[PDB]
Amino acid sequence: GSHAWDTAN
Amino acid sequence: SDQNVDSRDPVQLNLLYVQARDDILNGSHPVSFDKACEFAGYQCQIQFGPHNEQKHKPGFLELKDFLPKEYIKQKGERKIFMAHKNCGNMSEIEAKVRYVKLARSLKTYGVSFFLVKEKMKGKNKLVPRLLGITKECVMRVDEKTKEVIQEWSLTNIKRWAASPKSFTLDFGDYQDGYYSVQTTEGEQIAQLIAGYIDIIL
Numbered sequence: 001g002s003h004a005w006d007t008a009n
Numbered sequence: 010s011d012q013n014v015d016s017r018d019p020v021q022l023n024l025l026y027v028q029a030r031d032d033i034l035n036g037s038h039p040v041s042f043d044k045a046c047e048f049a050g051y052q053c054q055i056q057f058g059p060h061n062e063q064k065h066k067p068g069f070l071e072l073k074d075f076l077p078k079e080y081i082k083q084k085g086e087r088k089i090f091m092a093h094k095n096c097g098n099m100s101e102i103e104a105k106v107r108y109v110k111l112a113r114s115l116k117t118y119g120v121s122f123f124l125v126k127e128k129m130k131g132k133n134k135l136v137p138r139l140l141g142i143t144k145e146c147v148m149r150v151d152e153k154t155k156e157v158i159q160e161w162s163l164t165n166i167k168r169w170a171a172s173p174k175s176f177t178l179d180f181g182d183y184q185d186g187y188y189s190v191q192t193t194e195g196e197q198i199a200q201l202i203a204g205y206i207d208i209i210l
Binding site for chain 1: 010059098
């Protein structure tokens with residue numbers, strides 16, 4: 001939640 | 010994401026981290042109040058994970074486990090949480106690395122210090138002072154701020170003397186008047202100086 005981010009890059 | 014894989018040995022890192030952390034926490038490695046809270050911020054990141062405003066508030070920590078003794082009676086908890094906040098989502102390994110590098114970057118790092126007592130000016134009560142000894146100099150450090158106030162090249166030392174309650178330095182031509190302090194570690198200090206001076210030629 002706004003912290004444990006995820007990215008494709 | 011990804012790509013940069015961490016191949017650092019976490020076991021070795023933890024060992025370096027623990028030694029650095031313990032020396033700061035027990036006073037062996039004297040640091041300022043600001044630095045102690047910065048270290049404490051990384052410690053929090055390491056033991057608790059990213060700062061959570063909901064839980065990580067004053068009263069959440071046992072300050073004796075995060076700060077040198079002399080800084081516990083101050084408003085350090087507040088400063089500690091701001092430093093904790095700065096770490097953002099930093100990983101535990103990254104935090105340990107930052108902690109060790111910050112400790113190693115300090116001028117006081119790896120320096121042998123002795124807490125002695127100096128009698129001075131218009132003061133009847135002795136004043137605590139950190140006396141540091143390196144392979145290049147003897148330094149007088151403020152016991153509170155941990156800032157270097159005076160430094161003497163080892164090449165300027167003529168002779169020294171130790172008693173069960175003191176240590177004295179004689180700088181010969183350098184200055185008229187010896188430097189004498191109260192300490193129970195006089196011979197330990199003499200031995201270190203002695204060894205360092207033997208090599209200075």
